Amino acid sequence: NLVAEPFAKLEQDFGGSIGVYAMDTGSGATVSYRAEERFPLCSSFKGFLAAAVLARSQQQAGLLDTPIRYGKNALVPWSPISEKYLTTGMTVAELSAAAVQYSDNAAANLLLKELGGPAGLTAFMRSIGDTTFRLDRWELELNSAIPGDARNTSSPRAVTESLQKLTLGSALAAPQRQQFVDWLKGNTTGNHRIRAAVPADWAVGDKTGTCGVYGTANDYAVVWPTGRAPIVLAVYTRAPNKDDKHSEAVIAAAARLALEGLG
Ligand SMILES: *C(=O)N1C[C@](N)(O)CC[C@H]1C(=O)NC1CCNCC1
């Protein structure tokens, strides 16, 4: 597979495994490398979490507008938004933006509670036709990234297919699809991943994940090239040793090869 050779060289230099899926929604063209292998989700579940909350918000009138009045017991390390609004509370919409754009852990856990926990998010992903996605822990308990553990994993292909359904397809009603897209476009944590691979003129929405252990980190994105239909892509990494370091540069490099390989 000549298309695959640069991805194999990249993951060999990195000391692990890289999984890539990219789909051009204009051509139908794809690039695939280990696309159906499982990789840890890490914080990247929070994008799908926000989409599941938007889906619920379609039939639960005013759900997104609902103030959640949480206590200190709800706070988690790296909850910089939730900690700031601890007096006044946050709406479900504000919690969703914090979870997506800052990876706020308390916000992610409050939204998981809205859905019936990790099992509720998994059930939402099954409802849109994703059979690969698995989540069974709350933050910060889903991040062990142990090689061969299928818990708290998905595949680059399933992530890309689900992201397309939610951001571009019909899995959400249009006003909810639009809110999901705007949350992803405002992500603050992905500047060195897929965003570093795309021409500066192209709009990007993304969500990152970083377990760090076992060289584990990821990003998925919708990309709007000038004058073209969007591209959806996912890049996930892992490595065999607990102290193997993740690399943002390797994720950006894999994203460039994906864009270069599209027909
Ligand atoms: C998400 O992937 N994520 C990283 C972690 N190591 O798994 C811990 C939980 C979560 C997180 O808190 N990310 C923050 C992103 C912004 N800087 C602080 C960490």
PDB file of C-alpha atoms and ligand atoms in Angstrom:
ATOM      1  CA  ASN A   1       0.000   0.000   0.000  1.00  0.00           C
ATOM      2  CA  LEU A   2       2.062   2.983  -1.330  1.00  0.00           C
ATOM      3  CA  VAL A   3      -0.495   5.511   0.090  1.00  0.00           C
ATOM      4  CA  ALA A   4       0.099   3.980   3.560  1.00  0.00           C
ATOM      5  CA  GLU A   5       3.965   4.078   3.508  1.00  0.00           C
ATOM      6  CA  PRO A   6       4.356   7.668   4.861  1.00  0.00           C
ATOM      7  CA  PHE A   7       1.913   6.902   7.744  1.00  0.00           C
ATOM      8  CA  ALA A   8       3.857   3.710   8.608  1.00  0.00           C
ATOM      9  CA  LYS A   9       7.152   5.696   8.590  1.00  0.00           C
ATOM     10  CA  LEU A  10       5.552   8.423  10.774  1.00  0.00           C
ATOM     11  CA  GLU A  11       4.243   5.958  13.407  1.00  0.00           C
ATOM     12  CA  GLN A  12       7.580   4.019  13.374  1.00  0.00           C
ATOM     13  CA  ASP A  13       9.549   7.298  14.009  1.00  0.00           C
ATOM     14  CA  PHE A  14       6.949   8.170  16.741  1.00  0.00           C
ATOM     15  CA  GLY A  15       7.427   4.708  18.381  1.00  0.00           C
ATOM     16  CA  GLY A  16       3.754   3.666  18.286  1.00  0.00           C
ATOM     17  CA  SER A  17       0.579   3.458  16.198  1.00  0.00           C
ATOM     18  CA  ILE A  18      -1.297   6.221  14.354  1.00  0.00           C
ATOM     19  CA  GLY A  19      -4.919   5.846  13.159  1.00  0.00           C
ATOM     20  CA  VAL A  20      -6.273   8.183  10.480  1.00  0.00           C
ATOM     21  CA  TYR A  21      -9.571   8.486   8.601  1.00  0.00           C
ATOM     22  CA  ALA A  22     -10.417  11.436   6.317  1.00  0.00           C
ATOM     23  CA  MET A  23     -13.479  11.871   4.084  1.00  0.00           C
ATOM     24  CA  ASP A  24     -13.961  14.581   1.447  1.00  0.00           C
ATOM     25  CA  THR A  25     -17.776  15.135   1.558  1.00  0.00           C
ATOM     26  CA  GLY A  26     -17.473  16.786  -1.953  1.00  0.00           C
ATOM     27  CA  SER A  27     -15.806  13.860  -3.868  1.00  0.00           C
ATOM     28  CA  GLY A  28     -16.550  10.968  -1.447  1.00  0.00           C
ATOM     29  CA  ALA A  29     -12.742  10.399  -1.495  1.00  0.00           C
ATOM     30  CA  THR A  30     -11.127   8.907   1.623  1.00  0.00           C
ATOM     31  CA  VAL A  31      -7.735   8.339   3.228  1.00  0.00           C
ATOM     32  CA  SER A  32      -7.473   5.432   5.734  1.00  0.00           C
ATOM     33  CA  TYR A  33      -4.597   4.216   7.940  1.00  0.00           C
ATOM     34  CA  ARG A  34      -5.416   1.773  10.794  1.00  0.00           C
ATOM     35  CA  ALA A  35      -8.803   3.488  10.465  1.00  0.00           C
ATOM     36  CA  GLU A  36     -10.849   0.697  12.146  1.00  0.00           C
ATOM     37  CA  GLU A  37      -8.428   0.031  15.055  1.00  0.00           C
ATOM     38  CA  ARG A  38      -9.454   1.139  18.555  1.00  0.00           C
ATOM     39  CA  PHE A  39      -7.696   4.068  20.254  1.00  0.00           C
ATOM     40  CA  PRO A  40      -8.476   5.701  23.621  1.00  0.00           C
ATOM     41  CA  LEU A  41     -10.976   8.594  23.412  1.00  0.00           C
ATOM     42  CA  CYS A  42      -9.445  10.598  26.308  1.00  0.00           C
ATOM     43  CA  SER A  43     -11.134  14.090  26.444  1.00  0.00           C
ATOM     44  CA  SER A  44     -12.324  13.708  22.813  1.00  0.00           C
ATOM     45  CA  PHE A  45     -15.580  12.108  24.119  1.00  0.00           C
ATOM     46  CA  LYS A  46     -16.634  15.658  25.204  1.00  0.00           C
ATOM     47  CA  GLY A  47     -17.514  16.684  21.613  1.00  0.00           C
ATOM     48  CA  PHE A  48     -19.942  13.751  21.256  1.00  0.00           C
ATOM     49  CA  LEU A  49     -21.215  14.512  24.803  1.00  0.00           C
ATOM     50  CA  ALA A  50     -22.184  18.063  23.715  1.00  0.00           C
ATOM     51  CA  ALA A  51     -23.918  16.622  20.574  1.00  0.00           C
ATOM     52  CA  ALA A  52     -25.894  14.120  22.743  1.00  0.00           C
ATOM     53  CA  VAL A  53     -27.023  17.024  25.011  1.00  0.00           C
ATOM     54  CA  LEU A  54     -28.085  19.015  21.915  1.00  0.00           C
ATOM     55  CA  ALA A  55     -30.109  15.980  20.690  1.00  0.00           C
ATOM     56  CA  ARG A  56     -31.912  15.786  24.096  1.00  0.00           C
ATOM     57  CA  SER A  57     -32.470  19.603  23.963  1.00  0.00           C
ATOM     58  CA  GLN A  58     -34.632  19.194  20.783  1.00  0.00           C
ATOM     59  CA  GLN A  59     -37.587  17.588  22.691  1.00  0.00           C
ATOM     60  CA  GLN A  60     -36.845  18.876  26.273  1.00  0.00           C
ATOM     61  CA  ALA A  61     -38.022  22.517  25.964  1.00  0.00           C
ATOM     62  CA  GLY A  62     -35.507  24.974  27.498  1.00  0.00           C
ATOM     63  CA  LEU A  63     -32.998  22.220  28.449  1.00  0.00           C
ATOM     64  CA  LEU A  64     -30.041  24.139  26.924  1.00  0.00           C
ATOM     65  CA  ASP A  65     -31.214  27.330  28.747  1.00  0.00           C
ATOM     66  CA  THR A  66     -31.476  25.538  32.148  1.00  0.00           C
ATOM     67  CA  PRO A  67     -29.207  26.912  34.912  1.00  0.00           C
ATOM     68  CA  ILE A  68     -27.303  24.080  36.698  1.00  0.00           C
ATOM     69  CA  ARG A  69     -26.598  25.218  40.305  1.00  0.00           C
ATOM     70  CA  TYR A  70     -23.696  22.879  41.259  1.00  0.00           C
ATOM     71  CA  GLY A  71     -21.559  22.792  44.439  1.00  0.00           C
ATOM     72  CA  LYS A  72     -17.786  22.358  45.059  1.00  0.00           C
ATOM     73  CA  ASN A  73     -18.405  18.538  45.189  1.00  0.00           C
ATOM     74  CA  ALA A  74     -18.973  18.771  41.382  1.00  0.00           C
ATOM     75  CA  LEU A  75     -15.494  20.310  40.771  1.00  0.00           C
ATOM     76  CA  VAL A  76     -12.626  18.207  39.251  1.00  0.00           C
ATOM     77  CA  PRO A  77      -8.990  19.165  38.438  1.00  0.00           C
ATOM     78  CA  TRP A  78      -8.879  21.345  35.260  1.00  0.00           C
ATOM     79  CA  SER A  79     -12.407  22.830  35.603  1.00  0.00           C
ATOM     80  CA  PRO A  80     -11.297  26.465  35.068  1.00  0.00           C
ATOM     81  CA  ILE A  81     -14.704  27.653  33.742  1.00  0.00           C
ATOM     82  CA  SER A  82     -16.874  25.696  36.290  1.00  0.00           C
ATOM     83  CA  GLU A  83     -14.715  26.958  39.184  1.00  0.00           C
ATOM     84  CA  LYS A  84     -15.259  30.613  38.063  1.00  0.00           C
ATOM     85  CA  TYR A  85     -19.111  30.386  37.943  1.00  0.00           C
ATOM     86  CA  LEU A  86     -19.474  28.295  41.162  1.00  0.00           C
ATOM     87  CA  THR A  87     -21.655  31.118  42.765  1.00  0.00           C
ATOM     88  CA  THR A  88     -24.153  31.752  39.923  1.00  0.00           C
ATOM     89  CA  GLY A  89     -24.163  28.319  38.175  1.00  0.00           C
ATOM     90  CA  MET A  90     -23.966  27.728  34.416  1.00  0.00           C
ATOM     91  CA  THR A  91     -26.620  26.921  31.806  1.00  0.00           C
ATOM     92  CA  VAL A  92     -26.473  23.550  30.035  1.00  0.00           C
ATOM     93  CA  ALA A  93     -25.338  25.540  26.911  1.00  0.00           C
ATOM     94  CA  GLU A  94     -22.485  27.219  28.887  1.00  0.00           C
ATOM     95  CA  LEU A  95     -21.417  23.830  30.390  1.00  0.00           C
ATOM     96  CA  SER A  96     -21.392  22.335  26.836  1.00  0.00           C
ATOM     97  CA  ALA A  97     -19.192  25.184  25.494  1.00  0.00           C
ATOM     98  CA  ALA A  98     -16.787  24.791  28.490  1.00  0.00           C
ATOM     99  CA  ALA A  99     -16.529  20.974  28.052  1.00  0.00           C
ATOM    100  CA  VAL A 100     -15.895  21.298  24.270  1.00  0.00           C
ATOM    101  CA  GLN A 101     -13.706  24.431  24.119  1.00  0.00           C
ATOM    102  CA  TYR A 102     -11.664  24.161  27.381  1.00  0.00           C
ATOM    103  CA  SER A 103     -12.104  20.405  28.175  1.00  0.00           C
ATOM    104  CA  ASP A 104     -13.625  21.559  31.528  1.00  0.00           C
ATOM    105  CA  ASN A 105     -13.956  18.276  33.493  1.00  0.00           C
ATOM    106  CA  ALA A 106     -16.658  19.346  36.016  1.00  0.00           C
ATOM    107  CA  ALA A 107     -18.765  20.649  33.087  1.00  0.00           C
ATOM    108  CA  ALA A 108     -18.283  17.335  31.203  1.00  0.00           C
ATOM    109  CA  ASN A 109     -19.341  15.335  34.316  1.00  0.00           C
ATOM    110  CA  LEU A 110     -22.449  17.537  34.939  1.00  0.00           C
ATOM    111  CA  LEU A 111     -23.517  16.968  31.297  1.00  0.00           C
ATOM    112  CA  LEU A 112     -22.861  13.191  31.599  1.00  0.00           C
ATOM    113  CA  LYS A 113     -25.285  13.264  34.593  1.00  0.00           C
ATOM    114  CA  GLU A 114     -27.920  14.943  32.293  1.00  0.00           C
ATOM    115  CA  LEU A 115     -27.623  11.892  29.906  1.00  0.00           C
ATOM    116  CA  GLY A 116     -27.634   9.039  32.484  1.00  0.00           C
ATOM    117  CA  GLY A 117     -23.836   8.825  32.692  1.00  0.00           C
ATOM    118  CA  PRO A 118     -21.298   7.306  30.279  1.00  0.00           C
ATOM    119  CA  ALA A 119     -23.833   4.527  29.418  1.00  0.00           C
ATOM    120  CA  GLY A 120     -26.263   7.281  28.269  1.00  0.00           C
ATOM    121  CA  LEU A 121     -23.663   8.810  25.940  1.00  0.00           C
ATOM    122  CA  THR A 122     -22.791   5.329  24.577  1.00  0.00           C
ATOM    123  CA  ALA A 123     -26.548   4.742  23.964  1.00  0.00           C
ATOM    124  CA  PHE A 124     -26.789   8.077  22.052  1.00  0.00           C
ATOM    125  CA  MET A 125     -23.840   7.017  19.836  1.00  0.00           C
ATOM    126  CA  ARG A 126     -25.579   3.640  19.167  1.00  0.00           C
ATOM    127  CA  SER A 127     -28.774   5.608  18.244  1.00  0.00           C
ATOM    128  CA  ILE A 128     -26.904   7.422  15.358  1.00  0.00           C
ATOM    129  CA  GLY A 129     -25.470   4.076  14.067  1.00  0.00           C
ATOM    130  CA  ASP A 130     -22.041   4.117  15.808  1.00  0.00           C
ATOM    131  CA  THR A 131     -21.355   0.534  17.063  1.00  0.00           C
ATOM    132  CA  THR A 132     -17.643   1.208  17.938  1.00  0.00           C
ATOM    133  CA  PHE A 133     -17.811   4.092  20.482  1.00  0.00           C
ATOM    134  CA  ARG A 134     -17.492   2.887  24.118  1.00  0.00           C
ATOM    135  CA  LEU A 135     -17.438   5.116  27.248  1.00  0.00           C
ATOM    136  CA  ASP A 136     -17.884   3.707  30.813  1.00  0.00           C
ATOM    137  CA  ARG A 137     -16.184   6.278  33.139  1.00  0.00           C
ATOM    138  CA  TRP A 138     -16.500   9.930  34.165  1.00  0.00           C
ATOM    139  CA  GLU A 139     -13.513  12.354  34.258  1.00  0.00           C
ATOM    140  CA  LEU A 140     -10.782  11.717  35.411  1.00  0.00           C
ATOM    141  CA  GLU A 141     -11.239   7.876  35.382  1.00  0.00           C
ATOM    142  CA  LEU A 142     -11.388   7.124  31.569  1.00  0.00           C
ATOM    143  CA  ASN A 143      -7.728   8.055  30.786  1.00  0.00           C
ATOM    144  CA  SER A 144      -5.582   4.973  31.707  1.00  0.00           C
ATOM    145  CA  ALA A 145      -5.154   4.198  27.914  1.00  0.00           C
ATOM    146  CA  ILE A 146      -3.933   0.638  28.728  1.00  0.00           C
ATOM    147  CA  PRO A 147      -2.865  -1.221  25.554  1.00  0.00           C
ATOM    148  CA  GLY A 148      -5.509  -3.802  24.541  1.00  0.00           C
ATOM    149  CA  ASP A 149      -8.228  -2.297  26.840  1.00  0.00           C
ATOM    150  CA  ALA A 150     -11.267  -1.660  24.564  1.00  0.00           C
ATOM    151  CA  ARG A 151     -12.985   0.395  27.327  1.00  0.00           C
ATOM    152  CA  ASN A 152     -13.217   4.165  26.597  1.00  0.00           C
ATOM    153  CA  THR A 153     -12.147   3.729  22.926  1.00  0.00           C
ATOM    154  CA  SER A 154     -13.403   4.319  19.431  1.00  0.00           C
ATOM    155  CA  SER A 155     -11.873   4.058  15.932  1.00  0.00           C
ATOM    156  CA  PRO A 156     -10.783   6.947  13.679  1.00  0.00           C
ATOM    157  CA  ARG A 157     -13.357   5.813  11.070  1.00  0.00           C
ATOM    158  CA  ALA A 158     -16.284   5.597  13.573  1.00  0.00           C
ATOM    159  CA  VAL A 159     -15.315   8.998  15.058  1.00  0.00           C
ATOM    160  CA  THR A 160     -15.217  10.581  11.563  1.00  0.00           C
ATOM    161  CA  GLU A 161     -18.535   8.955  10.479  1.00  0.00           C
ATOM    162  CA  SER A 162     -20.282  10.077  13.711  1.00  0.00           C
ATOM    163  CA  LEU A 163     -18.780  13.596  13.483  1.00  0.00           C
ATOM    164  CA  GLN A 164     -20.059  13.883   9.868  1.00  0.00           C
ATOM    165  CA  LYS A 165     -23.584  12.727  10.878  1.00  0.00           C
ATOM    166  CA  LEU A 166     -23.750  15.296  13.726  1.00  0.00           C
ATOM    167  CA  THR A 167     -22.062  18.343  12.047  1.00  0.00           C
ATOM    168  CA  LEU A 168     -23.170  17.958   8.378  1.00  0.00           C
ATOM    169  CA  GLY A 169     -25.802  15.154   8.220  1.00  0.00           C
ATOM    170  CA  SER A 170     -29.274  14.821   9.781  1.00  0.00           C
ATOM    171  CA  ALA A 171     -28.445  13.245  13.199  1.00  0.00           C
ATOM    172  CA  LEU A 172     -29.259  16.665  14.818  1.00  0.00           C
ATOM    173  CA  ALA A 173     -31.987  19.134  13.753  1.00  0.00           C
ATOM    174  CA  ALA A 174     -30.434  22.154  11.951  1.00  0.00           C
ATOM    175  CA  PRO A 175     -30.463  24.641  14.905  1.00  0.00           C
ATOM    176  CA  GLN A 176     -28.706  21.995  17.057  1.00  0.00           C
ATOM    177  CA  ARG A 177     -26.255  20.988  14.273  1.00  0.00           C
ATOM    178  CA  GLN A 178     -25.320  24.700  13.917  1.00  0.00           C
ATOM    179  CA  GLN A 179     -24.686  25.069  17.698  1.00  0.00           C
ATOM    180  CA  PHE A 180     -22.454  21.951  17.671  1.00  0.00           C
ATOM    181  CA  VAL A 181     -20.429  23.324  14.719  1.00  0.00           C
ATOM    182  CA  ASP A 182     -19.989  26.724  16.455  1.00  0.00           C
ATOM    183  CA  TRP A 183     -18.807  25.037  19.696  1.00  0.00           C
ATOM    184  CA  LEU A 184     -16.191  22.998  17.767  1.00  0.00           C
ATOM    185  CA  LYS A 185     -15.049  26.113  15.812  1.00  0.00           C
ATOM    186  CA  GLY A 186     -14.391  27.865  19.178  1.00  0.00           C
ATOM    187  CA  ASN A 187     -12.198  25.051  20.604  1.00  0.00           C
ATOM    188  CA  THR A 188      -9.069  26.547  22.277  1.00  0.00           C
ATOM    189  CA  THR A 189      -7.028  23.301  22.817  1.00  0.00           C
ATOM    190  CA  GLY A 190      -6.307  22.158  19.211  1.00  0.00           C
ATOM    191  CA  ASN A 191      -4.070  24.890  17.702  1.00  0.00           C
ATOM    192  CA  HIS A 192      -1.078  22.459  17.353  1.00  0.00           C
ATOM    193  CA  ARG A 193      -3.033  19.468  15.912  1.00  0.00           C
ATOM    194  CA  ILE A 194      -5.346  19.367  12.843  1.00  0.00           C
ATOM    195  CA  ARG A 195      -5.517  23.225  12.844  1.00  0.00           C
ATOM    196  CA  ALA A 196      -1.685  23.300  12.296  1.00  0.00           C
ATOM    197  CA  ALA A 197      -2.101  21.051   9.188  1.00  0.00           C
ATOM    198  CA  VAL A 198      -4.741  23.120   7.298  1.00  0.00           C
ATOM    199  CA  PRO A 199      -4.242  26.260   5.206  1.00  0.00           C
ATOM    200  CA  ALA A 200      -4.840  29.348   7.433  1.00  0.00           C
ATOM    201  CA  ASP A 201      -7.841  30.452   5.205  1.00  0.00           C
ATOM    202  CA  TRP A 202      -9.856  27.245   5.975  1.00  0.00           C
ATOM    203  CA  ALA A 203     -12.392  27.210   8.857  1.00  0.00           C
ATOM    204  CA  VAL A 204     -11.885  24.374  11.397  1.00  0.00           C
ATOM    205  CA  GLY A 205     -13.943  22.950  14.247  1.00  0.00           C
ATOM    206  CA  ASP A 206     -12.244  20.298  16.393  1.00  0.00           C
ATOM    207  CA  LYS A 207     -12.065  18.482  19.700  1.00  0.00           C
ATOM    208  CA  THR A 208      -8.778  17.117  21.087  1.00  0.00           C
ATOM    209  CA  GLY A 209      -8.050  14.331  23.557  1.00  0.00           C
ATOM    210  CA  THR A 210      -4.823  13.754  25.492  1.00  0.00           C
ATOM    211  CA  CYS A 211      -4.319  10.771  27.877  1.00  0.00           C
ATOM    212  CA  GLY A 212      -0.504  11.383  27.654  1.00  0.00           C
ATOM    213  CA  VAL A 213       0.369   7.900  28.996  1.00  0.00           C
ATOM    214  CA  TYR A 214       1.064   5.230  26.338  1.00  0.00           C
ATOM    215  CA  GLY A 215       1.800   8.004  23.777  1.00  0.00           C
ATOM    216  CA  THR A 216      -1.989   8.576  23.608  1.00  0.00           C
ATOM    217  CA  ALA A 217      -3.531  11.736  22.083  1.00  0.00           C
ATOM    218  CA  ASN A 218      -5.958  12.572  19.290  1.00  0.00           C
ATOM    219  CA  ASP A 219      -7.944  15.211  17.422  1.00  0.00           C
ATOM    220  CA  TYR A 220     -10.995  15.127  15.154  1.00  0.00           C
ATOM    221  CA  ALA A 221     -12.209  17.979  12.990  1.00  0.00           C
ATOM    222  CA  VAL A 222     -14.545  19.290  10.366  1.00  0.00           C
ATOM    223  CA  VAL A 223     -12.554  21.453   7.899  1.00  0.00           C
ATOM    224  CA  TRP A 224     -14.153  23.906   5.407  1.00  0.00           C
ATOM    225  CA  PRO A 225     -11.784  24.414   2.453  1.00  0.00           C
ATOM    226  CA  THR A 226     -12.278  27.646   0.430  1.00  0.00           C
ATOM    227  CA  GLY A 227     -14.918  26.944  -2.266  1.00  0.00           C
ATOM    228  CA  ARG A 228     -15.353  23.223  -1.467  1.00  0.00           C
ATOM    229  CA  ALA A 229     -17.525  20.781   0.476  1.00  0.00           C
ATOM    230  CA  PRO A 230     -16.151  20.093   3.977  1.00  0.00           C
ATOM    231  CA  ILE A 231     -13.594  17.414   4.935  1.00  0.00           C
ATOM    232  CA  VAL A 232     -14.105  15.398   8.161  1.00  0.00           C
ATOM    233  CA  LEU A 233     -11.098  13.645   9.706  1.00  0.00           C
ATOM    234  CA  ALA A 234      -9.782  12.004  12.847  1.00  0.00           C
ATOM    235  CA  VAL A 235      -6.192  11.286  13.947  1.00  0.00           C
ATOM    236  CA  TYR A 236      -5.578   9.057  17.037  1.00  0.00           C
ATOM    237  CA  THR A 237      -2.238   7.844  18.472  1.00  0.00           C
ATOM    238  CA  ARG A 238      -1.048   5.309  21.042  1.00  0.00           C
ATOM    239  CA  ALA A 239       2.244   3.576  21.908  1.00  0.00           C
ATOM    240  CA  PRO A 240       3.187   0.431  23.855  1.00  0.00           C
ATOM    241  CA  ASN A 241       4.980   1.857  26.979  1.00  0.00           C
ATOM    242  CA  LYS A 242       3.201   3.829  29.741  1.00  0.00           C
ATOM    243  CA  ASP A 243       5.953   6.537  29.678  1.00  0.00           C
ATOM    244  CA  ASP A 244       5.912   6.895  25.813  1.00  0.00           C
ATOM    245  CA  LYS A 245       5.198  10.590  25.090  1.00  0.00           C
ATOM    246  CA  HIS A 246       2.327  11.801  22.928  1.00  0.00           C
ATOM    247  CA  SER A 247       3.235  14.217  20.108  1.00  0.00           C
ATOM    248  CA  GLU A 248       1.057  17.072  18.773  1.00  0.00           C
ATOM    249  CA  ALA A 249       3.564  17.395  15.856  1.00  0.00           C
ATOM    250  CA  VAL A 250       2.882  13.757  14.839  1.00  0.00           C
ATOM    251  CA  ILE A 251      -0.916  14.419  14.845  1.00  0.00           C
ATOM    252  CA  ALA A 252      -0.420  17.548  12.651  1.00  0.00           C
ATOM    253  CA  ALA A 253       1.942  15.579  10.323  1.00  0.00           C
ATOM    254  CA  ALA A 254      -0.607  12.711   9.969  1.00  0.00           C
ATOM    255  CA  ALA A 255      -3.367  15.286   9.248  1.00  0.00           C
ATOM    256  CA  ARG A 256      -1.208  16.849   6.466  1.00  0.00           C
ATOM    257  CA  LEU A 257      -0.689  13.399   4.841  1.00  0.00           C
ATOM    258  CA  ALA A 258      -4.486  12.777   5.060  1.00  0.00           C
ATOM    259  CA  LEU A 259      -5.268  16.100   3.275  1.00  0.00           C
ATOM    260  CA  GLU A 260      -2.483  15.374   0.695  1.00  0.00           C
ATOM    261  CA  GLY A 261      -3.888  11.848  -0.016  1.00  0.00           C
ATOM    262  CA  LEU A 262      -7.493  13.002  -0.721  1.00  0.00           C
ATOM    263  CA  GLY A 263      -8.797  12.519  -4.275  1.00  0.00           C
TER     264      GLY A 263
HETATM  265  C1  LIG B   1      -8.498  15.365  27.989  1.00  0.00           C
HETATM  266  O1  LIG B   1      -7.975  14.676  27.124  1.00  0.00           O
HETATM  267  N1  LIG B   1      -7.953  15.692  29.172  1.00  0.00           N
HETATM  268  C2  LIG B   1      -6.535  15.458  29.413  1.00  0.00           C
HETATM  269  C3  LIG B   1      -6.378  14.401  30.512  1.00  0.00           C
HETATM  270  N2  LIG B   1      -4.962  14.189  30.728  1.00  0.00           N
HETATM  271  O2  LIG B   1      -6.972  13.175  30.079  1.00  0.00           O
HETATM  272  C4  LIG B   1      -7.084  14.881  31.787  1.00  0.00           C
HETATM  273  C5  LIG B   1      -8.541  15.258  31.512  1.00  0.00           C
HETATM  274  C6  LIG B   1      -8.673  16.231  30.339  1.00  0.00           C
HETATM  275  C7  LIG B   1      -8.229  17.642  30.723  1.00  0.00           C
HETATM  276  O3  LIG B   1      -8.379  18.046  31.879  1.00  0.00           O
HETATM  277  N3  LIG B   1      -7.659  18.420  29.805  1.00  0.00           N
HETATM  278  C8  LIG B   1      -7.268  19.802  30.075  1.00  0.00           C
HETATM  279  C9  LIG B   1      -7.036  20.592  28.798  1.00  0.00           C
HETATM  280  C10 LIG B   1      -6.628  22.022  29.091  1.00  0.00           C
HETATM  281  N4  LIG B   1      -5.437  22.054  29.954  1.00  0.00           N
HETATM  282  C11 LIG B   1      -5.609  21.275  31.188  1.00  0.00           C
HETATM  283  C12 LIG B   1      -6.007  19.838  30.917  1.00  0.00           C
END
